[PDB]
Amino acid sequence: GVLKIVKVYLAVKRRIQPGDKMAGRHGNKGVISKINPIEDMPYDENGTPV
Amino acid sequence: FLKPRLVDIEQVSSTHAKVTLEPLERGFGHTLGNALRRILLSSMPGCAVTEVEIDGVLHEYSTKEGVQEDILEILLNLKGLAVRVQGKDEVILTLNKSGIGPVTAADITHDGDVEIVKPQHVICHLTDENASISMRIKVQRGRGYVPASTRIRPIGRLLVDACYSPVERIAYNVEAARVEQRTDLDKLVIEMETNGTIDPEEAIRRAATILAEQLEAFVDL
Amino acid sequence: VTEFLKPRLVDIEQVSSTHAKVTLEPLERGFGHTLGNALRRILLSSMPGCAVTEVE
């Protein structure tokens, strides 16, 4: 009882967002709270922000 | 008080230089260095690519024969190229390549004003003998980072996330100066890292204008 | 590209003359911290003022 079936494949590019569940390999899991601008990041003497 | 000046600009490498400001007193050194670093990393007018059209690629996720990698990796490599323009705020770059060989940025049919500062930046590798890729790269100036999902037509147009940020690593050091006769004077050296699209002197001078204008809320120029 | 959202004073709550609370609404992203820290250091570490230094 069907005529024809149309399958449409949608590719979603989900960027990292506040709330996305990010977790390391050692059981440390956390939700991203804020996407802090790079100028606000702690930088070492070399200037590379973490 | 004392006025910092462009005492020296040590262009140590093609990408990153070492600018020096000489006259500064207690606090000024660190304050001015941190303010300049934040202004540079926050809002510096870059000229990153923002829109790409391929000759025969329908969408971002398809693949044309003869190319080493996906079109998505081609777009991400395109985002990485450092390009600076002089006159036009908007410019369209046409890339036509044929035959086996990596498609570096050097083969881009540049206009009179637009020029690639890193011609060695590879975009894609052509593999088949009769493999040709023809892309129309749309490059426009801008400030900060704006993704393609938060902006504003044909199905064949591909959107690449904009990365208008010439600077990538700004490090400043505050150390004592070598004035003729005085103490408590420090020199500020900024180890700014750029992709090559901005002159460190004009970048520093622009950052100060942005800070001075923001300061103008409480100070008459 | 050089245009910026220059702040405009919106309401400066005038507490007694020994205290004040100045605020700006528009400004720019990341520029609030820059201006705040710059002003704080610039007026907290170096200002022309007169105070006692030595008593006998």
From Swiss-Prot, chain A:
The record's account of how the chain is modified after translation = Acetylated on several lysine residues in the presence of glucose.
Summary of the protein's practical applications? Co-administration of salinamide and rifampicin or salinamide and myxopyronin suppresses the emergence of resistance to both antibiotics.
The highest taxon in the source lineage is Bacteria
What does the UniProt function comment say about this protein? DNA-dependent RNA polymerase (RNAP) catalyzes the transcription of DNA into RNA using the four ribonucleoside triphosphates as substrates. Resistance to the antibiotics salinamide A, salinamide B, rifampicin, streptolydigin, CBR703, myxopyronin, and lipiarmycin can result from mutations in this protein.
* Complex formation: The RNAP catalytic core consists of 2 alpha, 1 beta, 1 beta' and 1 omega subunit. When a sigma factor is associated with the core the holoenzyme is formed, which can initiate transcription. The rRNA transcription and antitermination complex (rrnTAC) consists of RNAP, NusA, NusB, NusE (rpsJ), NusG, SubB, ribosomal protein S4, DNA and precursor rRNA; S4 is more flexible than other subunits. In pull-down experiments interacts with CedA. (Microbial infection) Interacts (via flap domain) with Escherichia phage lambda antitermination protein Q; this interaction renders bacterial RNAP resistant to transcription pausing and allows it to read through termination signals.
The family classification in the record reads: Belongs to the RNA polymerase beta chain family.
Name-wise, this protein is DNA-directed RNA polymerase subunit beta
UniProt source species: Escherichia coli (strain K12)
Name the gene: rpoB
Q: Which residues of the full protein are shown?
A: 1045 to 1094 of 1342
